[PDB]
């Protein structure tokens, strides 16, 4: 354009005409002279000039504001609460339409990390990613997804098109493993087994209305029929679809992965996988 036409002439651009963008480099203020001199911008004498000032919050003997108020159970045990990153169906459909989430493979946590739709932090007490029913309308995907926390409306909207919701629990170690598996493989330690949910999550993960991974599969069709009768729409049968073998991937626990197995050391260099032998190791890894 005109930029190259104007740059065709003029002397060369070397280290002799380096001009910084105006407004970014502000001049440095020096307390020397008449404008910024005398007191160097410190006011009159006393503690305001000598620098010997009380700490932030001291009101000179007077009881401060943050002390006269009694304590209350606001942040009692915040370092032990279970936090879950939100995930709406609208953003899931957006990722599927863009191609970062392929609806042909089972979607769990590592797939969402690779697609970079949610940011799962291994620290800060994060036990997975929850599900949000904000994108209920205009949602046509039909794909199984494994969510740690899925609401009733979200599960219903997923089952309308023909999806499978799997509620699973993982310890923070499993979260760190599933977030970035490449450093876990470069570590050199074998794949551990999954940990059981705590005492306050067994009835939640062993229930049929929550689609848990430990509940019996005999109560799932009843709950699906109840949801279909509640939220309307004729419930389709996935037994006649061509992707039947893909939706049946319920992910057996004590795996924290997919097609591998706990105790299988993964080596990046030289594509070879080693199988543990003996009998005690197998009994411990299959317990």
């Amino acid at each position: 354009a005109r930029a190259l036409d104007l740059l065709r002439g003029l002397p060369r651009v070397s280290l002799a005409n380096l001009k910084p963008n105006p407004g970014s480099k502000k001049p440095e203020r020096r307390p020397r002279g008449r404008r910024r001199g005398r007191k160097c911008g410190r006011g009159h004498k006393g503690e305001r000039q000598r620098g010997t000032r009380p700490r932030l919050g001291f009101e000179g003997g007077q009881t401060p504001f943050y002390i006269r108020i009694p304590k209350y159970g606001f942040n009692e045990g915040h370092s032990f609460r279970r936090q879950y990153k939100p995930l709406s169906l609208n953003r899931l459909q957006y990722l599927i339409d863009l191609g970062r989430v392929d609806p042909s493979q089972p979607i769990d946590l590592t797939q969402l990390v690779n697609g970079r739709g949610v940011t799962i932090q291994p620290l800060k007490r994060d036990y997975g990613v929850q599900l949000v029913e904000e994108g209920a309308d205009t949602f046509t995907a039909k794909v199984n997804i494994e969510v740690q926390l899925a609401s009733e409306l979200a599960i219903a909207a997923i089952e309308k098109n023909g999806g499978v919701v799997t509620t699973a629990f993982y310890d923070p170690r499993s979260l760190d493993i599933v977030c970035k598996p490449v450093p876990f493989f470069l570590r050199g330690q074998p794949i551990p087994k999954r940990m059981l949910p705590p005492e306050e999550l067994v009835p939640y993960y062993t229930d049929a209305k929550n689609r848990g991974y430990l509940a019996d599969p005999a109560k799932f069709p009843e709950a699906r029929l109840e949801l279909a009768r509640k939220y309307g729409y004729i419930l389709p049968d996935i037994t006649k679809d061509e992707l039947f073998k893909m939706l049946c991937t319920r992910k057996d626990p004590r795996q924290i992965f997919f097609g591998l197995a706990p105790g299988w050391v993964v080596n990046m260099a030289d594509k070879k996988i080693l199988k543990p032998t003996d009998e005690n190791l197998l009994k411990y890894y299959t317990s």
């Binding site: 990153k85 939100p86 995930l87 709406s88 953003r91 949000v132 904000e134």
Partner: peptide, 11 residues
């Protein structure tokens, strides 16, 4: 407040 439901933006 408009609606008494937990709204979500980019999430």
């Amino acid at each position: 407040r408009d609606s008494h439901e937990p709204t979500y933006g980019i999430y």
